[PDB]
From Swiss-Prot:
Expressed in early mouse development in central nervous system, lung, kidney, liver and spleen but only very low levels occur in thymus. One of its GO terms (cellular component) is nucleus. Interacts with BEX2 and KDM5A. Interacts via its LIM domains with ELF2 and LDB1. Also interacts with basic helix-loop-helix protein TAL1/SCL and can assemble in a complex with LMO2 and TAL1/SCL. The second LIM zinc-binding domain interacts with KDM5A. It is found in: Nucleus. Keywords: LIM domain, Metal-binding, Nucleus, Repeat, Zinc. It comes from the Eukaryota. Acts with TAL1/SCL to regulate red blood cell development. Also acts with LDB1 to maintain erythroid precursors in an immature state. This is Rhombotin-2. GO terms for molecular function: chromatin binding; metal ion binding.
Length: 123
């Protein structure tokens, strides 16, 4: 096996290399671009905090979910449990180094001060 530069999670929708920009969440088996993260029936874009359903090809929003599955699906309960929905995860930049090379060569003590407010949102 020969090594490759970049990412191994290509966009199964547009068949393009997911690198540098990407800014997407990790899906079940296949990874897709943010711009490519649109509905298969409405072609609309999804936002963080909303629940999405992954169809045979692309993502299908709750707006056309019933009518879409009704035409290309039907009836049939065969398999091993199926009825879960996932929320669109926030984008995480691949450009982030988290290492401690300075504390491994030289040992130094430092004092840090942080202020916390504490409080949750309801409305
Ligand atoms: Zn793509
Ligand atoms: Zn839709």
């Amino acid at each position: 096996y020969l090594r490759l530069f970049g990412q191994d999670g290509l966009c199964a929708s547009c068949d393009k290399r997911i690198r540098a920009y990407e800014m997407t969440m990790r899906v079940k088996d296949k990874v897709y671009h943010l711009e490519c993260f649109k509905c298969a029936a409405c072609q609309k874009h999804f936002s963080v905090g909303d629940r999405y359903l992954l169809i045979n090809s692309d993502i299908v929003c709750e707006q056309d979910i019933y009518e879409w599955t009704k035409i290309n699906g039907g009836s049939g309960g065969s398999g091993g449990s199926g009825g879960d929905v996932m929320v669109v995860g926030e984008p995480t930049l691949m450009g982030g180094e988290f290492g401690d090379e300075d504390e491994r060569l030289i040992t130094r003590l430092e004092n840090t001060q942080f202020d916390a407010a504490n409080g949750i949102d309801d409305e």
